[model samples]
Target: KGEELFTGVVPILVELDGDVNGHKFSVSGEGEGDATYGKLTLKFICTTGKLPVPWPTLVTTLVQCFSRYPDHMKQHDFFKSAMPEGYVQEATISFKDDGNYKTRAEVKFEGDTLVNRIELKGIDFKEDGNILGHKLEYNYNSHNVYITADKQKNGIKANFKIRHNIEDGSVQLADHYRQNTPIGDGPVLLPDNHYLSTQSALSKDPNEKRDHMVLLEFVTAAGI
Candidate 1:
């Protein structure tokens, strides 16, 4: 049980709700791999209503976070660093937003340890949605990042502190509900129908060979 394997992640889904021009919208994405592999993919779409003409600052800010995930993860030393032979790394997602709509996230890392000073900034839309400027400092031992804005109109300032592995995956749910995880809500419970329905559907062809298998993979890259 102490030996490590390939440690592949099935990707995690995250969803957040906000309003654009008084119309409701949803943001969804998934991320996988550890400090050495994987990235987050996000998309923004109108939910029950329509988006406003110019789009809201908050909406764009959320989108920026989504866009930055892959780029930032790639630049992070955590991913670029060399892993000890035979020991694979674990990846995780952690994000929090303030009442004022500003967001801070721990977009990528192995298990629950923090990467230091992994900072970024978004540019004005007039600049073609590019990162205006950026900074990166590597500290493998530090588990804290200071959230700060890079530009005048940057609506997000993100940083996160890492905690050692404390996770639970004892429960399972349907693909539909799993992909629609609620973000920023106090707490949520998945209905039994999700598991029951999935079981019923999968039972229809117990021997079916699906292209992609859906199962949870847990890996702790290191014990710091």
Candidate 2:
């Protein structure tokens, strides 16, 4: 038998006063609407948390990804979303790590396009970056788990939800596996799959005006 649909009411809210520090940030999401585009707002706060991400760290993370995929920026709107082709703004993003409390990161861009922050949660923390050493476990009756992390790229999500099976009483929910990987059919991508989660906002950064294209990179080791 599968598990219940774990509909215990997970409240996802947009932090109007939220800021992106080094660990995480929040997005104002107009959820569950229809017939039109929903509104998403990104706000920033200037404060280094207990484990703040220095500009150097943020720059390093961004540079690393861009260096690997330079052309990626060209396709992004961070550089051209304002002038009919560009818009830039610095916004704060927040998330929670294995540790309690929402983490922070300051995401700044040239015009209004906030590409992303160094939202790196030690996904394989226990494995120390060894892809083959990842570990995951699924309880017979555990569905719908919450995730908190930092700096997810635009249009990224935790990939955790109940796709359709609502009658199962012992199977894990869609969000459970979605958070772990992008192999399944979910509405969003597993933004931060290095380990568990690492997405701050659902919509792409306002500055990055164009649509955000999400991709799947990795998944955690499954535990059953």
Candidate 3:
């Protein structure tokens, strides 16, 4: 079943234009031949959203993966036709964003090894840091449900809290669990147990004990 294949993949043109701040960006792609080719165009826009990653980072990372991806396709291309190595350029890179991104690049051979140049823009924001005064804290007093997450090298615990705005009404995760715990998986060198979730005094497994709730798996997240 792993060897089975899917078909009808084709190449075509795509154009995208969107406004961010006051800047407008666009891209158009086209296919010329009827040969078996691969092209993928994906577009996404969020009306009102916040991302832990800015748009340029996401786009360039995607480009890195896409370009690296075709390394395998070139092997397939050998059975089909010849290919072009770097023509008249020494590999140029470009980027841009206002909040999100659109990327486009063009090159000309000028026939000789005298190629084109590079291009690059964006302004990113960092929220979730100290705000003026929004006043956030942990105040849990209910049944507990466990969630999975990663812990960074810093003392940051990347855990999820309850769903926003839908606070109270059904069973859900709430409160924040934190500490300077050691690294490793559960139980062995890692103290595998349900540690407390909050300092909220009204809580109970009854002895006024602020019950233990969340625990379980995670791996190091990296690469972007």
Candidate 4:
């Protein structure tokens, strides 16, 4: 098929383990989707120009790419926060390339890095967008990160941040969006001994349902 893709991303993201230049990484995946069925293949490789010791280069790179979190987390002091009482993430876990499709994933969070399956729902593309571009629907189970200062003092490193660009166009939604998301006019509160950055996006959107991005930073302490 003559589907369009941004080839330039290959050189920018995927780099080999050793080169005089800099750290690089590569993520390659392929999936097929139609109105009813789909399939996917994923291969992600990160190379920091150093054999067997790519961790440092990866962290350094991640820090620069994902600096968006530290500031936001710091503003909230919102670490160790709990996920919203009820957070749901639904994505077409698996599907074929035809108009006929089936539900693959039903996930929710237990703790960090844990969003186990809860239910699997069938999908009908009679209404919605991009039935082909669906890879994973990662929900913001909770847009919160728990940070421990003691761990930071021990010597931790952060590299390889998430990258975002409009390589692909906007995602389509099943329901039509009506207006701009809303905002409140009072002081935002948090749990005890917690501090999130003012730049945090965890606060819920005042619109139909409240949701935010889950962000955590692996940083070292001042002394360490």
Model 2 residue 10 CA deviation in Å? 28
Model 1's alpha-carbon lDDT is 0.23
Best candidate according to TM-score: 1
**What lDDT is reached at residue 19 by model 1?**
37
RMSD of 4: 21.2
What TM-score would each prediction reach against the true structure?
Answer: 0.25, 0.19, 0.18, 0.20
95-164 per-residue lDDT for model 1 (tens digits): 1120122223332223432211111122121211111110111111122222232223211123333221
Number of clashing residue pairs, candidate 3: 1
Q: Which residue ranges in model 1 land beyond 4 Å of their true spot?
A: 1-7, 30-34, 53-224
Please give the distance, in angstroms, between residue 103's alpha carbon in candidate 1 and its true position after superposition.
Answer: 4.4
2 versus 3: better TM-score goes to: 2
lDDT of 3 by residue, 175-197 (tens): 32322222222221111222112
Name the TM-score of candidate 2: 0.19
| CA shift of 212, model 4, Å | 27
Residue 18 of model 2 has an lDDT of 26
Clashes of 1: 1
The root-mean-square deviation over C-alpha atoms between each candidate and the true structure, in angstroms, is 19.9, 19.3, 23.7, 21.2
Task: For candidate 1, list the clashing residue pairs, or say none.
Answer: 35-79
Predicted structure 3: lDDT: 0.23
lDDT of model 1 at position 30: 34
lDDT of each: 0.23, 0.22, 0.23, 0.21
The runs of at least 3 residues in candidate 2 whose Cα sits more than 4 Å from the true structure, single-residue gaps closed, are: 1-104, 119-124, 128-132, 135-224
